[PDB]
Design a protein around this ligand. Structure first.
Ligand SMILES: O=C(O)CNC(=O)C(=O)O
Ligand SMILES: [Mg+2]
Ligand code: NI
Ligand SMILES: [Zn+2]
Length: 331
């Protein structure tokens, strides 16, 4: 069995190997990459996502989200308070202000320490989930707006034709902006490209041990667990590495830098934080190996998770027994 310890693997494809996206995902899996839940892909030196970023300040963040925490430093939830719209230029200036800027620090490890110690005492503002793309249309390799769609994958594998679309999203981060512990909708893959700026630290639980994290989360967030049998779908709970280690939960950590891709694999729980002002682009995708995870994915039916239009067909086809209850939580 490849990668039996479930370590995060880092890949350096050549320009030739960067042509065929599906083939390279399958290659990484042949080497056991999926067992970690997360992989890093460093593009060949000849590749570029676009020529410059010199012209991005006019993008609009319609609904910036202030991430307010409750709990203790290592075990907390965050809620998103909506803020007034601002441009990326306005947001970048805000990020770089004395109130929000990255503190002085020695290295990534020191910054990680400061994050876990101090995150709860601040409310950073995140520009998340903005539909759009920063890949140049002339970028032919690993262009996250030109991937094969999840609907087409389900149609190719299963023969059924469904509605829905699959587009990328932009994330504008600042110091301490936080992504809570989650798997993707329908336990899909994700791919994330860090276009510019400061790093993003990731934590991940191997898919084979995801239920260990779920059981700890039920213990640590007992009211939330009573409210909903899949409350991690709410994407609000944080648990630190120190707490994970204390409870014996297997996990790994890695820091993504600008110019790098990360792939999350089906049912790979992940969480993390941004080091400073940055911009990432991400999208969900499927492969044939996903289909069995899609069929088994948990679902939130309490009303909180509310998701895209395109998840309807996934539930309806893959999980017909669950469909009626889940759709009630959508409506
Ligand atoms: O970058 C972020 O804030 C969150 N991204 C992801 O969870 C992802 O790409 O799957
Ligand atoms: Mg612009
Ligand atoms: Ni994710
Ligand atoms: Zn729920």
């Amino acid at each position: 069995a490849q990668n039996p310890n479930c370590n995060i693997m880092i890949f350096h494809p050549t320009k030739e190997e960067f042509n065929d996206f599906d083939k390279y995902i399958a290659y990484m899996e042949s080497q056991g990459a999926h067992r970690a839940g997360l992989a890093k892909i460093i593009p060949p030196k000849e590749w570029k996502a676009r020529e410059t970023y010199d012209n991005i300040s006019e993008i609009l963040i319609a609904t910036p989200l202030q991430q307010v925490a409750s709990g203790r430093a290592g075990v907390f939830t965050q809620y998103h308070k909506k803020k007034k719209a601002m441009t990326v230029g306005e947001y970048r200036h805000l990020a770089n202000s004395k109130k929000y800027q990255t503190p002085p620090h020695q290295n990534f490890e020191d910054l990680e320490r400061k994050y876990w110690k101090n995150r709860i005492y601040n409310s950073p503002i995140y520009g998340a989930d903005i539909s759009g793309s920063l890949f140049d249309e002339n970028t032919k390799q690993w262009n996250l707006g030109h991937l094969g769609t999840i609907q087409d994958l389900l149609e190719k594998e299963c023969g059924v034709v469904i509605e829905g679309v699959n587009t990328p999203y932009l994330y504008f981060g600042m110091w301490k902006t936080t992504f809570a512990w989650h798997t993707e909708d329908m336990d899909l893959y994700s791919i994330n490209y860090l276009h510019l700026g400061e790093p993003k630290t990731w934590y991940v639980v191997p898919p084979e041990h995801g239920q260990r994290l779920e059981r700890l989360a039920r213990e640590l967030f007992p009211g939330s667990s009573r409210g909903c049998g899949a409350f991690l779908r709410h994407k609000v709970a944080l648990i630190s590495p120190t707490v994970l280690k204390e409870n014996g939960i297997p996990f790994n950590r890695i820091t993504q830098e600008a110019g790098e891709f990360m792939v999350t694999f089906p049912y790979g729980y992940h969480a993390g934080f941004n080091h400073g002002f940055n911009c990432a682009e991400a999208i969900n995708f499927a492969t044939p190996r996903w289909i069995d995870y899609g069929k088994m994915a948990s679902q939130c039916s309490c009303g909180e998770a509310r998701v895209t239009f395109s998840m309807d067909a996934f539930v309806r086809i893959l999980q017909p027994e669950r469909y009626d209850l889940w759709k009630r939580g959508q409506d």
